[PDB]
Each structure stands twice: as C-alpha cells, then as structure tokens.
Amino acid sequence: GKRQWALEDFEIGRPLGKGKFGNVYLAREKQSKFILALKVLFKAQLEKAGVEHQLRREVEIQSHLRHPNILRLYGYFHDATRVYLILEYAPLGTVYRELQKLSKFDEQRTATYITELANALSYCHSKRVIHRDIKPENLLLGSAGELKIADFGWSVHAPSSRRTTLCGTLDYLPPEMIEGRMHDEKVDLWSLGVLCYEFLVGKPPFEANTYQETYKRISRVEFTFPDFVTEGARDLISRLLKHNPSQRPMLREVLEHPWITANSS
Amino acid sequence: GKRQWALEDFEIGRPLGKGKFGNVYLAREKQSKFILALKVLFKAQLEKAGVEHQLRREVEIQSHLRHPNILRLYGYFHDATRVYLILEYAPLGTVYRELQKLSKFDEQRTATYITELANALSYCHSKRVIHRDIKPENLLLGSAGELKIADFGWSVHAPSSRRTTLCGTLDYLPPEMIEGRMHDEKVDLWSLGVLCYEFLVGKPPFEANTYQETYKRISRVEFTFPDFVTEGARDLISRLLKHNPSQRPMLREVLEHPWITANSS
Amino acid sequence: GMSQVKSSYSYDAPSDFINFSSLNIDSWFEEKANLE
Amino acid sequence: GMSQVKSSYSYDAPSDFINFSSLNIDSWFEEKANLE
Numbered sequence: 085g086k087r088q089w090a091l092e093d094f095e096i097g098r099p100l101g102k103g104k105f106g107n108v109y110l111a112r113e114k115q116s117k118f119i120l121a122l123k124v125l126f127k128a129q130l131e132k133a134g135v136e137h138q139l140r141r142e143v144e145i146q147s148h149l150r151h152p153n154i155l156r157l158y159g160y161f162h163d164a165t166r167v168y169l170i171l172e173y174a175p176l177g178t179v180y181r182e183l184q185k186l187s188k189f190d191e192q193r194t195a196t197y198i199t200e201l202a203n204a205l206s207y208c209h210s211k212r213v214i215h216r217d218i219k220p221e222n223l224l225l226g227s228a229g230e231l232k233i234a235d236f237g238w239s240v241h242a243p244s245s246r247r248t249t250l251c252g253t254l255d256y257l258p259p260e261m262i263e264g265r266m267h268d269e270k271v272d273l274w275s276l277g278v279l280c281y282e283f284l285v286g287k288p289p290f291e292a293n294t295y296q297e298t299y300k301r302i303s304r305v306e307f308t309f310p311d312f313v314t315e316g317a318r319d320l321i322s323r324l325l326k327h328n329p330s331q332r333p334m335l336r337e338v339l340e341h342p343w344i345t346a347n348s349s
Numbered sequence: 350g351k352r353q354w355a356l357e358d359f360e361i362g363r364p365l366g367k368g369k370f371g372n373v374y375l376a377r378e379k380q381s382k383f384i385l386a387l388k389v390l391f392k393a394q395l396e397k398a399g400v401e402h403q404l405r406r407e408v409e410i411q412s413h414l415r416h417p418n419i420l421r422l423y424g425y426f427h428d429a430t431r432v433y434l435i436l437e438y439a440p441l442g443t444v445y446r447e448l449q450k451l452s453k454f455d456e457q458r459t460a461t462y463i464t465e466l467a468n469a470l471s472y473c474h475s476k477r478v479i480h481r482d483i484k485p486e487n488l489l490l491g492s493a494g495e496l497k498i499a500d501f502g503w504s505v506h507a508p509s510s511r512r513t514t515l516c517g518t519l520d521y522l523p524p525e526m527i528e529g530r531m532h533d534e535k536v537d538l539w540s541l542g543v544l545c546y547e548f549l550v551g552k553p554p555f556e557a558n559t560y561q562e563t564y565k566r567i568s569r570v571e572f573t574f575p576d577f578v579t580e581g582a583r584d585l586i587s588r589l590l591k592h593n594p595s596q597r598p599m600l601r602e603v604l605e606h607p608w609i610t611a612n613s614s
Numbered sequence: 615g616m617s618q619v620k621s622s623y624s625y626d627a628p629s630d631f632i633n634f635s636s637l638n639i640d641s642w643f644e645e646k647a648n649l650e
Numbered sequence: 651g652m653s654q655v656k657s658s659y660s661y662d663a664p665s666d667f668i669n670f671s672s673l674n675i676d677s678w679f680e681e682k683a684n685l686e
C-alpha cells in the first residue's frame with residue numbers, strides 16, 4: 085500500500101484534555117506544520133475496561149463522516165501499547181467549559197448551538213448513524229466559535245433494526261433505555277432537549293443526588309421550568325422530552341422551530 | 350407481582366467452579382430440597398470489565414431456551430453487590446475436564462457429543478440465537494453423561510441482520526471475525542469443527558505460541574491431521590472448517606453425516 | 615468523554631420463585647423479533 | 651467461561667499518511683448497509 089502514519093510524524097505539545105485511557109495532545113504534523121489533536125489511548129486499559137469494540141465504532145464511523153459541525157477524524161494508527169487518533173483541532177475548547185464560565189447561556193447562544201448540532205445530527209441520521217452520547221462534554225468549539233460534536237465511542241451505524249445497548253450518560257439517558265426497551269435514532273432528539281434545557285438553565289432537568297432518583301425522574305418525564313425560560317424555549321424542550329420516542333419531532337422540525345429561527349444566527 | 354427469589358432461599362455448599370467475577374456453588378433450594386448451581390457475580394467487577402451487557406444477553410437468552418442439551422437458567426436475582434444465576438446442576442462436570450483426563454476422545458464419544466451439541470445448536474439457530482463461544486470449557490455433563498452447552502455471555506439473538514462484535518475464544522475464533530467481517534450463525538459451525546478436531550486429537554488445529562500466529566493460521570485455514578484421524582472424521586472437520594462461512598454445512602448435514610451416524614449412539 | 619452507565623439489573627427474565635417439585639415460552643424470541 | 655479476545659486493531663478506517671496543505675466517502679455507510 086501507501087505511506088502509513090507514524091508517531092515520528094508529529095511534534096507534540098501541551099495536553100488539551102485528560103481522559104481515562106489517555107490524553108489528547110496539541111499536535112503538529114512535521115511536513116506541513118499543520119495543527120492537530122492527537123488522542124492517545126492505551127490498549128491495556130481499553131481491554132481492561134472492555135471498550136475496544138466501542139473504540140472501533142468511533143474510528144470506523146467518525147472517520148467516514150464529513151460535516152463542518154462534526155469534529156474530523158483524519159485517521160488512526162497504533163503501536164504495541166497505544167492507539168492514536170488524529171483529530172481536528174478545536175481552538176475554543178469544550179462547550180462544557182464555556183457553560184461552566186457563564187453558568188448558563190442566553191437564548192441566542194443556545195438556539196445557535198442547537199442548530200449547529202441539529203445539522204450535525206441530521207447528517208448522521210441521514211447516514212443511519214446514531215450518536216447516543218450528546219452532552220456538553222462531547223461538544224467542542226471551532227475558530228469562529230462553531231459547535232463540533234465528537235466522542236463517537238457510543239455511536240452506531242443502525243441502518244435497518246433498532247438497538248439494545250444501554251449506553252450514554254446519566255442525566256442525558258433516554259427513558260426507553262432506562263425502561264430496558266429497544267431504541268432508535270430518536271434517542272439523539274431526547275438528549276438534544278436535555279442539552280437545550282441545561283444550556284438555558286445551567287443544570288439538567290432530571291438532576292438528583294442518586295442515579296436511582298434520576299432514573300425515576302427520566303422514566304416519569306418529571307421536570308419543571310424556572311420562570312426565566314421563555315414560552316418558545318419551553319415549547320421546544322417539551323416536544324423533545326417526550327416519553328414516547330415517536331412523539332419527539334424530527335430534526336427538520338427543530339431546525340424550523342419558531343424559537344430556533346427567532347434566536348438562531 | 351409474585352414471590353421473588355432470595356439468597357435466603359438456598360443452602361450453599363462446595364464451590365463447583367471459580368470464575369473471574371465470582372464462583373458457582375452447589376446449591377439447594379430449601380422448600381423442595383432441589384439441587385442447583387448458584388452462580389455469583391460481583392457487580393463491581395462486571396462493570397469494571399464492562400461486561401454487564403454480556404451478562405444481560407446471557408440471562409435474557411439462556412432463560413428462554415428449553416433443550417435437554419442446553420444447561421437451564423431457571424432464573425436470576427440480585428442484591429446491592431452481586432448478581433445470582435440459578436442454573437441447572439451438571440453432576441459430571443465440564444467436558445474440558447473429561448478431555449484433560451483422557452488426553453483425547455475416541456470416535457464414538459466425539460460423534461455423540463457432536464450430535465448432542467449439534468442438536469442444542471440446531472434449536473438455538475431455530476430461535477435465531479448464535480452461541481459464539483463453543484469450546485470444551487463451556488460444555489458440561491449431565492447424569493447420563495449428556496452434553497450441555499452453557500456460558501451464554503457471548504450469545505446473541507440475531508433474527509434479521511448479521512453481527513459485528515469480535516468475540517469468542519482464541520483457538521475457536523472463526524476467520525471472518527479475525528478478518529474483521531460481519532458474521533452470522535455459521536460461526537457456531539466453524540467452532541463445531543474446531544471442537545470435533547480437539548476432541549479427536551487432544552489439541553486444537555491452529556494452536557500456536559502466540560495469538561498473532563494462531564490468527565494467521567485460522568485466516569489461512571492452515572492445519573493438518575494426525576495419522577489416526579479417520580477419513581470419516583477428516584471429511585466432517587474439513588467441511589466445517591471452510592474459510593467461506595456459506596460453504597460450511599447446515600447442522601442438519603452434520604447430524605446426518607455418515608461418520609456421525611456410524612459412530613454416534 | 616466516554617463513560618459506562620450503571621445498569622439497574624432489571625432483565626426481561628424470570629425472577630419468580632419456583633416450586634421445584636414439580637411442573638411454550640421459547641416463543642419469546644419470535645415475539646421479540648416480531649416487534650415493529 | 652467468558653473471556654475477551656485480543657483485537658488486532660486493524661480497522662476499516664484511514665491509516666494513510668496525508669499531505670495536509672492541501673486537498674464522496676460518506677457513501678461508506680450506504681455501501682456497508684447494502685451488503686447482502
């Protein structure tokens with residue numbers, strides 16, 4: 085075949101982020117002087133945690149996606165002990181960090197993110213891919229402050245049948261997963277509303293002291309709005325946060341939502 | 350609902366077998382004085398290894414299977430720290446242990462096992478279930494020395510589409526898994542031939558010093574027969590050990606195989 | 615990043631006490647498949 | 651019993667060096683689905 089990636093192809097700098105199986109480092113490719121993020125995963129730890137299968141889905145899916153709102157995976161390589169992922173650089177860090185600095189986002193910032201993400205998701209869902217792990221942590225920011233979804237380890241190409249894997253993150257889990265039912269692409273829409281809530285409010289709607297309580301709340305769609313959340317915002321979240329997945333709107337309905345169009349830029 | 354299982358329902362004795370996440374114990378249910386195997390799995394260790402999903406597939410599948418050659422899962426229960434599986438007792442231990450005592454099996458013993466297992470598999474495959482982990486270790490023995498497959502943690506209900514999970518055990522892995530291709534029910538037939546070989550020979554056909562070498566051998570269907578292996582036996586193994594899954598025989602062809610009918614009892 | 619969600623260990627599987635001495639349900643697979 | 655098989659980490663994914671300055675393949679999903 086052709087020339088293959090080598091660790092010796094990259095000049096490494098500051099660690100951008102720490103993770104359980106290794107870090108992401110600010111990286112430069114020598115020949116071009118091009119800025120990347122090199123994610124370094126240890127095989128021993130991936131196998132110990134039994135997540136290489138999830139690592140394969142990430143690499144195999146993300147790398148075949150092209151969208152200005154989905155963080156690129158240019159390619160991958162490995163040695164004896166580690167797996168390397170060559171990811172697009174996102175200069176403005178995570179959305180999670182932005183949220184932590186501002187406590188909560190205004191309507192304009194939220195609706196814009198929720199557009200950019202709804203576009204990225206619309207593209208995924210067109211390729212029959214479900215992300216399954218939408219959350220502030222998995223959302224990054226580009227040069228012009230554009231939203232980029234990443235962290236595709238729980239994602240899945242589901243072209244025909246529904247899926248059964250209980251996966252995602254505590255506050256963002258859809259009820260059909262909690263109740264042990266098969267799931268479809270409509271899980272991304274649920275977590276999209278939990279995102280929209282947390283964006284506007286500063287905390288997620290079913291947050292509790294125990295995972296047990298949260299699970300009950302999500303199951304029951306048990307949540308209220310603070311007084312500042314506008315009718316428009318209230319409408320959209322309520323629509324996305326339906327217990328019955330088929331009662332959640334299509335992403336096209338989210339993109340054309342009066343509150344989205346009236347605040348998105 | 351109705352009365353549910355409790356740890357206080359069982360008198361415990363000798364440990365039948367040790368495993369990574371806990372042991373199987375000889376167990377008696379108090380009210381009936383009925384002999385069981387109680388398998389005890391620790392949640393902390395299942396979650397650490399990221400295998401609860403595999404544990405759910407085992408419980409949900411095995412418990413809905415009924416065959417005299419498939420070890421029963423009468424039911425399950427759990428407390429704060431552990432999961433308990435209430436399994437049928439197999440008085441004559443594992444087939445693996447029998448093989449270790451005898452070094453190798455004669456043709457009569459082999460063909461009989463391979464019938465009993467082919468029947469169990471035939472039933473699974475009729476319910477659209479693939480076991481995916483056939484090996485001497487996962488095979489137990491009943492009162493009259495009947496074969497019982499168990500260990501359904503890698504199993505899967507695959508009613509429509511092929512599967513992608515790399516799983517099983519080193520020497521028994523089908524080549525389509527090694528080459529990273531989707532797989533179907535025909536993986537049970539491959540491992541059925543690797544079983545049949547190991548039964549007759551005492552070691553499996555692609556055995557090597559490294560997993561890397563084994564992988565090459567399986568990929569290449571690289572194996573030879575010792576001089577004592579009869580033409581009949583040679584034919585069946587060669588048929589089951591086809592690189593192309595669709596060239597492997599149906600189980601019905603295995604059950605009616607001249608060497609199987611001429612040696613099975 | 616990636617994380618593993620805690621399961622509630624509530625399986626579509628028998629938890630009912632059974633009276634052992636003494637005493638149709640494999641259609642579960644056909645029914646679970648026939649879900650639209 | 652149950653065990654985890656070692657993977658060979660050979661993925662249907664780009665390992666080819668790329669010349670960054672400077673320079674259709676999302677059909678991969680439709681093609682992988684269209685396998686009989």
Ligand SMILES: COc1ccc(Nc2nc(NCCc3ccccc3F)nc(Nc3ccc4ncccc4c3)n2)cc1OC
Nearest residue numbers: 100101102103107108121171172173174175177178180234
């Ligand atoms: C893609 O894989 C990962 C993605 C992000 C992170 N975590 C991270 N954490 C922080 N602060 C730490 C706060 C914090 C602390 C505890 C938990 C969450 C949390 F967010 N900053 C950043 N910045 C950036 C900036 C540009 C990037 N471009 C490309 C790729 C990554 C980039 C990460 N990333 C880690 C990952 O793998 C391990």
Ligand SMILES: COc1ccc(Nc2nc(NCCc3ccccc3F)nc(Nc3ccc4ncccc4c3)n2)cc1OC
Nearest residue numbers: 365366367368372373386436437438439440442443445499
């Ligand atoms: C179903 O889950 C398990 C099944 C079998 C075992 N392992 C086991 N190992 C031994 N000797 C140990 C040799 C040995 C050593 C190292 C590796 C493999 C190996 F085989 N004897 C037995 N005997 C029996 C007898 C009747 C049974 N009836 C019902 C259920 C189990 C039964 C097990 N089992 C463990 C399991 O879970 C942890």
